[PDB]
Structures are given as C-alpha cells and as structure tokens.
C-alpha cells in the first residue's frame, strides 16, 4: 500500500487568448479528493490549498502564453505533479506536462532529469517550455527540489492529520 498524492492543474486558451480560470483535480491514494478552481476548493475549509494552487495556476497561465501555436481554436496546457511514499520509506516523484492531452515533457524529481519525447513535433513544445522555465521563470534545481519536498510535505500532512480514514 503505497500512499500517493497527485495534482492536475489545467489552463485553457481560445485563439491565443488564455482564459482567466483554471481547474485543479487532486487524487489522494488513487481516490478523488479535491476539485478546485481559482475561487475555491470543494472536497469530492481548504484555504491553504486554495492559496497554493491559485499561485501555481497563475504561473501556468504565463507558461501557456509563451506557447505560440499556429493552430487556432482550443488549446490546453496541463501540468501534473505526483509523489509517493512506499512501505520501505523511499519516495517517488515527478512533474509532467500535457498539451492538448498529449504528454510532451516530464521530469523525475528524485534525479532532476528531464525526459524528452520521441517526435520532433513534441520536442518543439518541450524546448519552448524548458526555455520559458529556465530564462523567463528563472527556475534553478532548488525550485525543483522544493517542488519535490512540497509534494511529500503535503502527503505526510494529509496522512498525519487523519485524512485517509
């Protein structure tokens, strides 16, 4: 029985114009747990989770704004963040990006290495995001080690406060 925590932040844009709202889907140990938007979180008082996820949503909006696509109409950027705690006290964790539902960029947060996809069409999306994250967002390894630590910190908080019972 590995305990797991998984966030799914989603932003949308129509004809280049990125929408103001975003939806977060959180899964705790596989089962659904929280469904948030910018305004509030509902359990499927959550003020800490609202504050944390809104800040993330804002940053992801800016990310999508730097993905200048030729295709008109609907476009969606989704960032997944997942972590685990195994029985032997070892951790797994990763950060994944989907564009229009298709996985284009992943990072193993144990090793801080990026996994690039196969097609050069997908590599174009990835190096756009990585350029944004490195130069515009200005994220070092520290940011990613903090990201790793934040996911594990919340999971241990949700176990310790008795939210799997």
């Amino acid at each position: 029985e590995p305990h797991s925590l998984r966030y799914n932040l989603t932003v949308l844009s129509w004809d280049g114009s990125v929408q103001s709202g975003f939806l977060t889907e959180v899964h705790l140990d596989g089962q659904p747990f929280l469904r948030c938007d910018r305004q509030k979180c509902r359990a499927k008082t959550w003020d800490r989770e609202t504050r944390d996820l809104t800040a993330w949503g804002k940053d992801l909006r800016m990310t999508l704004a730097h993905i200048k696509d030729q295709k008109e109409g609907l476009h969606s950027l989704q960032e997944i963040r997942v972590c685990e705690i195994h029985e032997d006290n070892s951790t797994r964790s990763s950060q994944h990006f989907y564009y229009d539902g298709e996985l284009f960029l992943s990072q193993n947060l144990e090793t801080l290495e990026w996994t690039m996809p196969q097609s050069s069409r997908a590599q174009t999306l990835a190096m756009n995001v990585r350029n944004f994250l490195k130069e515009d967002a200005m994220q070092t390894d520290t940011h990613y080690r903090a990201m790793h630590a934040d996911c594990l910190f919340e999971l241990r908080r949700y176990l310790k406060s008795g939210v799997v019972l």
Partner: protein
C-alpha cells in the same frame, strides 16, 4: 502620515522599522552571514507575519538566519533567539543544518555549504542616526529609493484597482526606471499595474498620460484586452481589464 522610514543603509528597503537588502550573488550560508555582518547587519530574522508581510511577495529561495542544533534538535536564530510558533513552516528538502526562506512564510532545510542568494536585515534602532532615511511615504508602506509601494492581495478588476489606489491618494504601479525600481525583480506572481492600451493608436501609456519608454518592459500576449499585469524580470502580460487580479499601488510623482 507622511513619515520618513527610519535610519537604514543607502538604497536598502525600509519597511516598518526594519531595513532589508536582497543579495543576488550566490554564497554559502557562512559566507552570507559574514557578508551581512561586514555591513553592520545580519541574515533575515522572521519575528512577525504582520510587521514583515513584504516577505509574502518574494520570488525564489534565499538564505535566512535560521540554524539547527544537533543536540537540542531545535531551530534557532543566529543570535540564539528562539523561533516563535505561528510564523514558519519548516520543510525537509535537503539534509543540512541551515534553512532557505521562501514565500508563504516557508523555510526549506538546505545544506549550509550550497551556494544560494541571501537576505540581510537590520532593525532601524541598531543603525546609527548619521545614515540614510527613505523619502516621505505613508506609515505602513514599503519605501525603496524614495518611491513607496504597497501590495494588495484582495483581487479586483483593473478599474476597481485604479479606484482602490485612488482612494489612498495613489495610483497603480508605474515602471519608469529599471535602476531605481530593481526591487521589482524579486516580486512573485503577477499584479495589475497602471499600463493601458489605446486600441486606435495601438500604443501603451501610463495612468497619468506618460507614454511607455523603450527597453523598459517586455510585453507578451496572454489574454486579449487593453490592460497589463506586471510580472518578474520586467514583463507586462496583456490581460482583460475586467479579470480580477491582485495589484500594486505606488505614490505618484
């Protein structure tokens, strides 16, 4: 109020009887403490969420004055002072006996020999009277190089944010100088500022008429509209004026 923010070193941020400076040269904890000491100060002490809410808006991770004792197993400030509760959330990132500050009053455990940027802080009383006073500002506002700033976390649309700043005899953020407003590099997230698009002329101008100077902001299309959000590294994201966001007021010229 019209108060001069009290004795601080030249070009430091003065907020609520406390001077601050953010050092972008990455040094280890020991080197960073020495660096603050050499400037008659020390590393960031976090004693109150109310008096130090400037730290809510800070981007990235910075060495803080906090240290771990192996024997006790407790966290204390450089000078021996106890860490009060209801202030910091200590997070287990790396194995180490030092901590990095990060926004939302967080403290990440870091190895003391890892290079990071750092924050010096000294109280106004411990700086002597023969020193720099930051120019006239309202009582509880951030003073930096004689300009006054306040960050409003209650989110409102552009027009309401103008009225909000107007009600306190101020205006929305106006960027006019990368040198004098280099503090804006360390702001996190995005915020309404006073930059407006004229659709006819296709131009950008400030609330008070002033036209946007070249090489001052980078403007990116995010959401179609005639208003601009400030974001870090001097960026101006185009946003719909009706979209509720946070904002930055500043005393006018």
């Amino acid at each position: 109020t019209e108060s001069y923010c009290g004795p601080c070193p030249k070009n430091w941020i003065c907020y609520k009887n406390n001077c601050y400076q953010f050092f972008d040269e990455s040094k280890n904890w020991y080197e960073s403490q020495a660096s603050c000491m050499s400037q008659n100060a020390s590393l960031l002490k976090v004693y109150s969420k109310e008096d130090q809410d400037l730290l809510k808006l800070v981007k990235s991770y910075h060495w803080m004055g906090l240290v771990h004792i192996p024997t006790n197993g407790s966290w204390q400030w450089e000078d021996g002072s106890i860490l009060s509760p209801n202030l910091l959330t200590i997070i287990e990132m790396q194995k180490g006996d030092c901590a990095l500050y990060a926004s939302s009053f967080k403290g990440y455990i870091e190895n003391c020999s890892t290079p990071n940027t750092y924050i010096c802080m000294q109280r106004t009383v411990q700086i002597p009277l023969t020193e720099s006073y930051c120019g006239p500002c309202p009582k509880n506002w951030i003073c930096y190089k004689n300009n006054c700033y306040q960050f409003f976390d209650e989110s409102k649309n552009w027009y309401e944010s103008q009225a909000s700043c107007m009600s306190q005899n101020a205006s929305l953020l106006k960027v006019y100088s990368k040198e004098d407003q280099d503090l804006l590099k360390l702001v996190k997230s995005y915020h309404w500022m006073g930059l407006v698009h004229i659709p006819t002329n296709g131009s950008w101008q400030w609330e008070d008429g002033s036209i946007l100077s070249p090489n001052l902001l980078t403007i990116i299309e995010m959401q179609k509209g005639d208003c601009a959000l400030y974001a870090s590294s001097f960026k101006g994201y185009i946003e719909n004026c009706s979209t509720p966001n946070t904002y930055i007021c500043m005393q006018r010229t």
